[PDB]
Ligand binder design. Sequence first.
Ligand SMILES: CNC(=O)CN1C[C@]2(CCN(c3cncc4ccccc34)C2=O)c2cc(Cl)ccc2C1=O
Ligand SMILES: CNC(=O)CN1C[C@]2(CCN(c3cncc4ccccc34)C2=O)c2cc(Cl)ccc2C1=O
Ligand SMILES: [Cl-]
Lengths: 305, 305
Amino acid sequence: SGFRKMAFPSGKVEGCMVQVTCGTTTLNGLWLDDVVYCPRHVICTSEDMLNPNYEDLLIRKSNHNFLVQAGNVQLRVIGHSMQNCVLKLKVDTANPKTPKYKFVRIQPGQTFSVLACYNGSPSGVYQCAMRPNFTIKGSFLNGSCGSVGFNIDYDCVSFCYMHHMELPTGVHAGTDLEGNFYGPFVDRQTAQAAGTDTTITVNVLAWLYAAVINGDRWFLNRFTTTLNDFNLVAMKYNYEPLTQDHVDILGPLSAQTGIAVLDMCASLKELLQNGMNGRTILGSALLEDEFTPFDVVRQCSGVTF
Amino acid sequence: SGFRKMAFPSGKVEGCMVQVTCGTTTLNGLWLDDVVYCPRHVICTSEDMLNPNYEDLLIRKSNHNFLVQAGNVQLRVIGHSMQNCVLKLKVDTANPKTPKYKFVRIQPGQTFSVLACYNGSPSGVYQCAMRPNFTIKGSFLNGSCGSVGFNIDYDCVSFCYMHHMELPTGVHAGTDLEGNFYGPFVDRQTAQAAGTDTTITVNVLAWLYAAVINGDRWFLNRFTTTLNDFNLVAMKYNYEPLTQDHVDILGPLSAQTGIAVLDMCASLKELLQNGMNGRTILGSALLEDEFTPFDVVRQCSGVTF
Ligand SMILES: CNC(=O)CN1C[C@]2(CCN(c3cncc4ccccc34)C2=O)c2cc(Cl)ccc2C1=O
Ligand SMILES: CNC(=O)CN1C[C@]2(CCN(c3cncc4ccccc34)C2=O)c2cc(Cl)ccc2C1=O
Ligand SMILES: [Cl-]
């Protein structure tokens, strides 16, 4: 019993974290095989950030300008190249701790673990989700750039996020491991803002199933709804539209608890229109949307890595 | 910016998790140096669990009755002894992945990371606190016994908890790494119940200081309170009494924000009386009590917004 915001075990990723320095700028890098991946803004000073020409700043750099530190050992940079907003530093030593890995681009609503790092050293691990507005509500200070987000599928680490910046509202923006930003953001100190966010409906429904599996059933009702009527309601409350894909994905949870997905949608409609009336669900007075249907199944079944 | 329930990176602990089997019973063990630590109920069947005589059950065992598996390798047990509710199995191989470690007994209100494991394999990591009633609100399934709680301040792992059981309310009970239970619990399937729990007041205050640091002050007021008047009101909402120790411990957070501890106590008194009125504090509609003063200092910026 119990239901916690749980992150994947971080050991396989800790063994890849390094410190990357270019002049006065220092941040984190991800060392996989003989390449170190890091945000391309490591080559920028604070003045360059205002309007950087990355190809131009890069051409002025030699391999020896990049200092890469793995623990107490200095790695020798033998090559460098840019791919989108990521810098790839070729080193003379393959990481002996390189796990089985993939680079994957995730969609809004998907969750992942973040291993927050400072100076190439891991400080903490937390779980979060790619918001529908493509930002993440992380916990990051200056020095955290290059920290990565990941999931584990069997024994394979799927790297999905690399940290680049914090927006004025305190939320975060970054790229996939191929340097493509999530969201309409750019790597420059210019006026940028997170768009209006929405709630991840399929995730709220999944968390309502985790509450039922855990003994919280006060919110269940005798009613059902159509998918179309539910979406008319959900749009009124800044909730993402629920698709037939989402309904199919919740099937296993609908069978484990005996509550059909449109029956759980009728519970969610009543919660939106009436509030919780002094009650909580899994120790929360808000409807939680950072657990996917897969996360609920995994936590309630004890999957190991 | 941001504030998340953050766990320590688990890699140092993952490298110590093993599977311990004694006949039909299987659970997790912690392999440090040449000793494997595990709950003593590994020698019990479901029948034995009502009134087990651990000394009588153990004397009937030899070293070769204990099967210890580390990854795909079987370890050879060369000795065994019981210390309180923990079994210590001497093995023929020192763990090459043994980190720098300490065994520490924690007090209620203290937080720690849990690496939940099944069959000697890590499944997830989450943060939690020792409740005032000495239970923890974990996420644990059958097969999770032997999973551990820890803190990793600096490069040393301080092991503080080993999982033994789930109480009828779904909360969890366990021991320190010397086998001494936290709380009035016994490793028997006899009638046991968690005592009435309370909110960790010093932790709520710390998290209010975190909200101020991150730039939010809506909940503050022009009032102050005496320590005694605060406790008379707090205990009416099932909040733990705030001691002079707690007030001294909140000194640094008080100096960083410019808000006296008793002035923050007046704010908490008002929040308990009025609720949040549609507002949130650090993304929560409830007052959070599982972040200590030390956790807030570790996660937050040293510059108040
Ligand atoms: C809040 N940021 C700033 O005042 C200056 N700023 C610096 C920077 C690099 C470091 N960084 C941070 C990243 N995460 C948490 C941070 C917390 C506090 C300060 C900085 C943080 C940025 O956002 C950045 C990178 C890129 Cl690709 C594009 C723009 C910027 C940028 O605007
Ligand atoms: C809920 N408990 C039970 O039905 C049977 N039960 C078995 C057991 C060992 C395993 N275990 C669990 C530990 N954590 C999460 C569990 C979740 C679901 C079932 C069991 C879980 C116990 O509580 C146990 C150990 C000890 Cl030292 C003293 C008593 C018990 C005990 O009562
Ligand atoms: Cl303590």
